[PDB]
Subunit: 142 residues, 4 copies
């Protein structure tokens, strides 16, 4: 199995406050499950080659997704911003697979990624444990 | 908009204790979002014609999904049991649409449904507010 | 250290639906802390001789407390029903100590307790692991 | 009645990551209750003259309390850092009343408070809605 444990940091009240509105798990590698403990989120997966997505909404209405997973035994991540309401995590997660438009990002196997949304919100994913089967990352808003 | 608020009742410790492991929202009707308040779960949707799925796992390893949504202005529900680990909610939610194998169940527009899993766990969805745009249901395990 | 992990089973929608409104830890035995994981609640304590209280409120307005702890190396529990709004868990938890009016209930070292409230709600605490330092109980509202 | 809604912003992973370990409500003003919705926390109280406390623990072991309440119709707040394990919120909340050692801090009726702990963690409580019965504050760990 692989697990990825996320801690969510929110830095700047002027950007609003984000909460989870959806959580998906892709079906490869025997799937996987999200769980919560002590204010953290863990994605547990059946092997290498799958992922999951958290979609967040701020109290100012902004919608963004965070994807994390393992590709060929190495962690990967992505963040998509500026989402329309119909672009649910259920739409986004499969776009990393089957030659979809985000597959290239998975294939980069990034240990960190940074993006600012068009409305001005910074998002970062930073793995703090970057090797092995029990991975850890901080997700930082603002 | 439509909302569906769920309260989860668990009746029988011998069946184990279930917790959420995934939550999806289908992309029709401008999508929608899950939220939590006072121990309840609300699916808020952009209009009639979409749905969302909660997948649960028990501490005995059982995997089941609960689907709720609105079809032609009337509520619907379904429960799928006996799931394999790769049959994530991301797999299940779309099966209600595009002539998929569960579409017939959505089309029934049920206000209640009951199923027992092969391993012997009873599940019921029962709408308590069955008309209008702010719907309410109890989800009962065991 | 001692821990007590609780699983809350709400059986009967006719009683309404309860959620936590307060969680206290008494200061003996070097204190302790509440945590949440996978829908369960764990009280971790620094030794034998202390306790904590969860207060619950139903969506019908009912207020009740559940107390769990370890006294002379044996688990104990209590449920207090029919509470007024001013009788917060902060009021109730100390009543088990310093010769307070609930000390005798702690002293019973009960592994199970059953009580039905003035509005008809049945409550049960039943330890499923009843010895050792890693205690487990089901809390059932019926 | 009065309510205080809190949004918790954790800014700085170097301080570790905090989660709630206790939540108390003082018994004046007909008590009150904590609730959670969309990742936020609301203390609802029966009138002016009471308060509640959230105790937090970091994954590095740090223990701190945040107190919020209403005194003579004006909001107040406090943050206590450097706590020992035996100094539970159940110990701290009463210290604001009955001529206890923290009463003067309640009496200040602060709309903002800033303190840095012995291990270097910066804490701020800043009310964003500072008047009326529906109060709002940001709690920032930095």
């Amino acid at each position: 199995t692989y697990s990825i444990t996320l801690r969510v940091f929110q830095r700047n009240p002027g950007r609003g406050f984000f909460s989870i509105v959806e959580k998906t798990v892709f079906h490869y590698a025997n799937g996987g499950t999200w769980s919560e403990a002590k204010g953290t989120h863990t994605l547990t997966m059946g092997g290498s080659g799958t992922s999951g997505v958290l979609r967040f909404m701020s109290d100012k209405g902004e919608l963004i997704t965070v994807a994390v997973g393992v590709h060929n035994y190495k962690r990967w991540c992505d963040v998509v911003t500026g989402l329309k309401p119909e672009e649910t995590a259920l739409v986004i997660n499969p776009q990393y697979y089957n030659n979809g438009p985000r597959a290239y990002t998975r294939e980069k196997q990034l240990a960190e990624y940074n993006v600012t949304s068009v409305v001005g919100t910074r998002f970062e994913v930073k793995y703090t444990v970057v090797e092995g089967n029990n991975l850890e990352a901080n997700v930082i808003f603002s």
